[PDB]
Amino acid sequence: TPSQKVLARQEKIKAVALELFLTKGYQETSLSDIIKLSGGSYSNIYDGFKSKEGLFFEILDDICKKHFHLIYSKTQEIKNGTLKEILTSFGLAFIEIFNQPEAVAFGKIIYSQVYDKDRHLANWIENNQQNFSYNILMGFFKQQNNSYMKKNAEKLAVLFCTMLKEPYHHLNVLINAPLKNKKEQKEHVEFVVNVFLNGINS
Amino acid sequence: TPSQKVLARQEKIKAVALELFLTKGYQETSLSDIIKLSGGSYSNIYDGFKSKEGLFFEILDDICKKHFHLIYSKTQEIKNGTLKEILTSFGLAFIEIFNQPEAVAFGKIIYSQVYDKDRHLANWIENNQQNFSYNILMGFFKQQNNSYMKKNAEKLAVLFCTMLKEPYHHLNVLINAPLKNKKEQKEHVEFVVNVFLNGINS
Numbered sequence: 222t223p224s225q226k227v228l229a230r231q232e233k234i235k236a237v238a239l240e241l242f243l244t245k246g247y248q249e250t251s252l253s254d255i256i257k258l259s260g261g262s263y264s265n266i267y268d269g270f271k272s273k274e275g276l277f278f279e280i281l282d283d284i285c286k287k288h289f290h291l292i293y294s295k296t297q298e299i300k301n302g303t304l305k306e307i308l309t310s311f312g313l314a315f316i317e318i319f320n321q322p323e324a325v326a327f328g329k330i331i332y333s334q335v336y337d338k339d340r341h342l343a344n345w346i347e348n349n350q351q352n353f354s355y356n357i358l359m360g361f362f363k364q365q366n367n368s369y370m371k372k373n374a375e376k377l378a379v380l381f382c383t384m385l386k387e388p389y390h391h392l393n394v395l396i397n398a399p400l401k402n403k404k405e406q407k408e409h410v411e412f413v414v415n416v417f418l419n420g421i422n423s
Numbered sequence: 424t425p426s427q428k429v430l431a432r433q434e435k436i437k438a439v440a441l442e443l444f445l446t447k448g449y450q451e452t453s454l455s456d457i458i459k460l461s462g463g464s465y466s467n468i469y470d471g472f473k474s475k476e477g478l479f480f481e482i483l484d485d486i487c488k489k490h491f492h493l494i495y496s497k498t499q500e501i502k503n504g505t506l507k508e509i510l511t512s513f514g515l516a517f518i519e520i521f522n523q524p525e526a527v528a529f530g531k532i533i534y535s536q537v538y539d540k541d542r543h544l545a546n547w548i549e550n551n552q553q554n555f556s557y558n559i560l561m562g563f564f565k566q567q568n569n570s571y572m573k574k575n576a577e578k579l580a581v582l583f584c585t586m587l588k589e590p591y592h593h594l595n596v597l598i599n600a601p602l603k604n605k606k607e608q609k610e611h612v613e614f615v616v617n618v619f620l621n622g623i624n625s
């Protein structure tokens with residue numbers, strides 16, 4: 222099928238681009254390095270494949286879509302459940318993803334673009350709110366029979382994720398601080414879930 | 424006094440450097456731009472004034488020292504106090520500092536150094552743990568008559584600060600998201616302080 226070939230070719234460009242971002246470095250890689258190694262399976266084409274920043278965000282689309290499915294699947298896998306169980310189940314999956322060398326490597330790429338005068342990153346964040354894992358949590362909060370949880374669902378979602386994820390990821394990205402092993406992951410999830418539900422007057 | 428003149432000259436270099444970082448840009452400013460405009464009140468000298476990254480961290484030293492005094496002063500100003508009052512008093516001051524155009528501008532500088540092969544930033548973070556506002560909070564926790572608060576004092580300090588500060592600062596830095604006005608600051612502090620002390624089962 223024509224359509225299959227197109228998509229398969231788009232997958233070749235992204236794969237070349239990722240390998241170059243990892244071996245050669247994001248900053249020293251130019252569009253042309255990517256077109257070159259893509260061969261005559263590119264020659265000046267049409268999508269967000271018009272700059273290396275565009276390719277980079279086409280890759281994140283994929284990864285975000287991959288993490289969302291992963292985290293949704295693990296949550297709905299309960300038949301239950303107490304908010305307690307739902308929060309920790311989400312905890313575990315979310316935290317696990319941020320403790321992969323991959324999450325740090327892309328983190329470094331995002332932070333280096335802080336001076337980008339084309340706002341590719343702002344466009345991307347503004348056009349993908351729907352695709353972040355925060356929405357899954359935001360989804361469970363509304364359903365709970367509660368005035369507060371329903372009214373503040375987006376904020377509690379965002380807060381719980383942040384407590385789980387910062388300042389660790391930040392330090393991972395800037396100074397290469399070590400990741401958590403799985404025991405530390407688990408430990409830190411129960412910690413955060415306790416304070417979130419019951420607070421430090423327990 | 425010789426010593427006064429030395430210090431006054433060190434203050435001229437930092438001031439030139441900050442003005443160049445703000446007008447010209449951190450990345451396009453080189454050491455030499457700073458030596459030049461410093462005049463023959465520099466000529467190849469000795470401290471952390473041997474690179475522009477060093478000057479930059481000599482400035483942050485000052486700012487961090489300035490914010491610490493500011494936040495300590497506001498906390499001890501109680502004669503009380505319930506953990507509730509102490510947390511919010513700290514909240515207000517901490518959050519107020521992160522909602523200044525200055526906190527964003529330096530944020531952008533730090534994030535752009537993500538690929539620095541000299542680890543100036545890691546050295547600086549590793550050699551200044553004692554100078555962060557987190558310690559003030561960590562200090563009050565130990566004193567509370569409690570097993571948990573005392574055992575986990577550094578972690579609760581770090582958690583409470585993060586809940587206050589992320590993901591807002593991050594979005595401020597990367598995509599230029601808007602700051603909070605004072606009502607939003609206050610609102611968000613009481614919000615965070617409630618969840619921190621009492622959790623979402625209130």
Ligand SMILES: C[C@H](CCC(=O)NCCS(=O)(=O)O)[C@@H]1CC[C@H]2[C@@H]3[C@H](O)C[C@H]4C[C@@H](O)CC[C@]4(C)[C@@H]3C[C@H](O)[C@@]21C
Nearest residue numbers: 281284285288318319324327328331346353355379590
């Ligand atoms: C957008 C994230 C924070 C935004 C957020 O949490 N939502 C707030 C939205 S709003 O207030 O309601 O407007 C920030 C920017 C985009 C995210 C990055 C990208 O989403 C890419 C992800 C890929 C992940 O699987 C690994 C972390 C990561 C490499 C990033 C970590 C962190 O979640 C980021 C860097």
Ligand SMILES: C[C@H](CCC(=O)NCCS(=O)(=O)O)[C@@H]1CC[C@H]2[C@@H]3[C@H](O)C[C@H]4C[C@@H](O)CC[C@]4(C)[C@@H]3C[C@H](O)[C@@]21C
Nearest residue numbers: 388483486487490520521526529530533548555557581
């Ligand atoms: C170091 C901060 C986070 C580290 C932290 O909170 N402590 C954890 C230490 S550890 O787990 O116990 O090892 C990160 C890096 C250094 C901090 C930056 C610098 O401290 C400079 C400050 C200046 C502030 O007044 C404005 C924000 C800011 C421009 C920064 C915001 C944020 O607090 C930063 C960027």
